[PDB]
Amino acid sequence: AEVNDPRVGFVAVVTFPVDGPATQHKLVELATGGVQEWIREVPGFLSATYHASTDGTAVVNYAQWESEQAYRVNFGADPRSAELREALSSLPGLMGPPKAVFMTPRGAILPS
Amino acid sequence: AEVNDPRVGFVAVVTFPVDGPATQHKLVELATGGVQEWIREVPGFLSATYHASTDGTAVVNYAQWESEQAYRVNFGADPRSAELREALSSLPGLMGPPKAVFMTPRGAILPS
Ligand SMILES: O=C(O)Cc1ccc2c(c1O)C(=O)c1c(O)cccc1C2
């Protein structure tokens, strides 16, 4: 969704530490390769965007959710979220567990 | 911009460690201030979305740019950006220097 859409009530920023750009590429390919097709229809799921850090050390996911409850009930309480975590943790090149930060949009600056 | 808009060639995720929920509002208020409107007309700027960590300890800015040059020079060479940095660094309640992670969007999972 647009980054400043009011429907976005909850965001998770997840950082995955990797051993270099080849693993960055593989990790994004894995994340968008069909393992999480099921998440697209989850009520409250708005988006998951995966980025490669320019220094080659991490893959960052910026995920928008309609609310914390929707995230908790429709993602965290679904066992398929554990399946997803296992999938992404299986990749060679992943150097530590993913780190998450939870947060709510509070202000924005859009273009003129 | 939409998170998967093809114009977004470069993203910065800037984290500002703060001492509490009160300073989070102060920091967002300052950063989305109104004197900061010149940023809206910077060539290549697409969006700045300021978030408050749910735990009250951080303010996180997800910023969309057309390219790394737009951020670095169009924004970064303008003196107003140095002004803005100093402003943010001088706010009481800051627990340390802002930390930026630079990255490129590589893939997105979205609802149909
Ligand atoms: O200079 C730093 O590293 C700290 C720091 C302070 C203020 C800002 C930034 C920043 O990075 C940004 O990036 C940034 C951006 O990308 C898009 C919009 C506003 C800011 C404001």
Distance from CA of A2 to the nearest CA of B (A): 4
Nominal resolution (angstroms): 1.7
Asked if A83 and B27 touch (Cβ cutoff 8 Å), the reply is: no
B107 and A29: CB-CB below 8 Å?
yes
Asked if B24 and B80 touch (Cβ cutoff 8 Å), the reply is: no
Atom of ligand 1 lying closest to residue B98 CA: 4
Residue A108 to residue A82: CA distance in whole angstroms: 33
| Two tokens, residue B39 | 């940023």
B106 and A13: CB-CB below 8 Å?
no
The residue whose CA is least distant from atom 3 of ligand 1 is: B100
| Two tokens, residue A73 | 């009930």
Closest-CA residue of A relative to B37 is: A109
The number of distinct structural domains making up chain A is 1
The letter for the amino acid at A111 is P
Residue B100 to residue B112: CA distance in whole angstroms: 32
Asked if A36 and A84 touch (Cβ cutoff 8 Å), the reply is: yes
Residue A33 to residue B6: CA distance in whole angstroms: 20
Asked if B8 and A83 touch (Cβ cutoff 8 Å), the reply is: no
Name the 3-class secondary structure at B37.
helix
Residue A92 to residue A107: CA distance in whole angstroms: 38
Asked if A21 and A56 touch (Cβ cutoff 8 Å), the reply is: yes
The residue whose CA is least distant from atom 8 of ligand 1 is: B85
- Domain limits for position B60: 1-112
Residue of B36, B103, B111 with shortest CB distance to A40: B111
Closest-CA residue of B relative to A6 is: B49
Residues of chain B with C-beta less than 8 angstroms from the C-beta of A68 = 54
Q: What is the CATH number of the domain that holds A42?
A: 3.30.70.100
- Three-state SS sequence of A45-69: EEEEEEEEECCCCEEEEEEEECCHH
Asked if A12 and A101 touch (Cβ cutoff 8 Å), the reply is: yes
Residues of chain B with C-beta less than 8 angstroms from the C-beta of A40 = 109-112
